[PDB]
Structures are given as C-alpha cells and as structure tokens.
Design a binder for this molecule. Structure first.
Ligand code: 5UM
Ligand code: ZN
Length: 257
C-alpha cells in the first residue's frame, strides 16, 4: 500500500491513483511575486470557540486530532469560501530535518512542518460526500518553523508517546485549536486536492502567510512517532510530505498586498 518510502512514495502513487497527475493537484509552490492580490477576497472567519476535540489517532501516515463535527461547533467561513465549513480534524506533515517537512513551499522555501486544519462544506451533509465535490473541503494550512516553543502545541506533543504506532488512539478532549494559529490571518488561496491518496480534487486551499514557531524539542517529538504498527519493524514517522506539484492552469490569489 501507499506510503512515503522509496518503493511506495509519491512517485508511485499515480499507479493506484491516476488523479495524481491531474489538473488541480496539491501541494504547490507559492510564487509570492506571481500570486495576485484579490481585493475582493473577504477576511477569513475562524470560529473555533465552541470546538470539541475528541481523540488523537496515529493512522500510519500522520496523527489526527479529531473533532465533533455533528454540529457547527468549529467552523471556517469567509475568505474565498461560500457557505460554512466544519472542522473535522487537524494533522501535520514534517521532515527528518528542520530544512524540510512542509508540503507547500514559498518561493521554493521548505518549512520544518505544515499544519492542516481540515473542514468540510456543510451543504454536503458529511465528510464522505464532501470529498466527492469540487468545493467539498477547505483546508487551512499553516507553516511551522523551528524557533521559540508554541505553548498551544504542547498538549499535542505530550500525548504522542501514547500513540506511538499505527492504529493507536487516545482520548484528547478539551483541546483548543485557536492556540495553533499565528497572529495574522493573511493568506494565499487556490483550488487543489488532498495531498495523500486518494488525492481527490475537492479542496479549496487557504495557506497562511505567517508561520508559527515551534521549538526544536517539540518537532523532535513528532519524529519519534512510528509509521509501523506495534510489534512490526520500527520505521520513524518522518518526511511524510508530498513534494510540490505542477500549478498547471491555476492562479494563486493573495488576500494581502
Ligand atoms: N493532507 S490533506 O490534504 O489535508 C488530507 C489528506 C487526506 C485526508 N483524508 C483522507 O484521505 C481520507 C479519505 C479516504 C477516502 C476518501 S477521503 C484529509 F482529510 C486531508
Ligand atoms: Zn495534510
């Protein structure tokens, strides 16, 4: 099955998932000088005050913090979006080294990691239906660089020892994702895809200009996770990112001048 190794990595995905070579694949390089300011873009509306986190899961590709998405408790609206998108989970992609790890790049620059807050369009009723629609998902992407610690991330870091291997989950209630956001909500936006199989072309990407900083100790703890299940040969969960894909017939829009 698919993964991030030499024999099952991003270069191989197209064989099982031909959409990997499609017209609106993610991630992409964000060329800051070619992106166009769109003064008609509304400010992002992030309403996470009633968020209800439930669980944290190691799924063998990353770890997801999952939320109760059975009502409008934590939603994203505005920006390039029409309607309401409900937060279902967030996860990260990261590197084996601080110099790589993000999926999107900015003028070819790689960050140490990238946070994805995944939301689905409520007009489609549930996540499974949404991923089958061109405007089904909105993913808010946030770059991580290594520097000072991110206090709001620490609760996540501290539970990782309990979900070291594939298939492990742990209760994770009362986590506030507002603690993972940078100060500015300035963003770039473009139409794209899931960055892992099945690579469905259902995502409006909203990538924040301002990275958050996390400590070297924090990202080191990400790199102690395992891709494998318990009792299988240990393979560290690192470099779980897809490289930048061709932009093709798309324009990246900026919310800021
Ligand atoms: N890295 S990402 O583009 O933000 C992403 C990548 C994958 C999923 N989820 C799934 O792929 C789960 C699905 C299985 C079958 C259809 S969707 C997701 F919800 C978000
Ligand atoms: Zn992701």
């Amino acid at each position: 099955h698919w993964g991030y190794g030499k024999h099952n990595g991003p270069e191989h995905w197209h064989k099982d998932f031909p959409i990997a070579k499609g017209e609106r694949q993610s991630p992409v390089d964000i060329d800051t000088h070619t992106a166009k300011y769109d003064p008609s873009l509304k400010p992002l509306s992030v309403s996470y005050d009633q968020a209800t986190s439930l669980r944290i899961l190691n799924n063998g590709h990353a770890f997801n913090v999952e939320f109760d998405d059975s009502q409008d408790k934590a939603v994203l609206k505005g920006g390039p979006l029409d309607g309401t998108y409900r937060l279902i989970q967030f996860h990260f992609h990261w590197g084996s080294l601080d110099g790589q790890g993000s999926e999107h790049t900015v003028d070819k620059k790689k960050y140490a990691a990238e946070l994805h807050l995944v939301h689905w369009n409520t007009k489609y009723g549930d996540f499974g239906k949404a991923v089958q629609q061109p405007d089904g998902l909105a993913v808010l992407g946030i770059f991580l660089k290594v520097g000072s610690a991110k206090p709001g991330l620490q609760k996540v870091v501290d539970v990782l020892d309990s979900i070291k291997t594939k298939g492990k989950s742990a209760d994770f209630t009362n986590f506030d994702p507002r603690g993972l956001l940078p100060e500015s909500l300035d963003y770039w936006t473009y139409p794209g895809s899931l960055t892992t199989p099945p690579l469905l072309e259902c995502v409006t990407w909203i990538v924040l200009k301002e990275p958050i900083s996390v400590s070297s100790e924090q990202v080191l703890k990400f790199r102690k996770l395992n891709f494998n299940g318990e009792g299988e040969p240990e393979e560290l969960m690192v470099d779980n990112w897809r490289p930048a894909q061709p932009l093709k017939n798309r324009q990246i829009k900026a919310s800021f001048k």
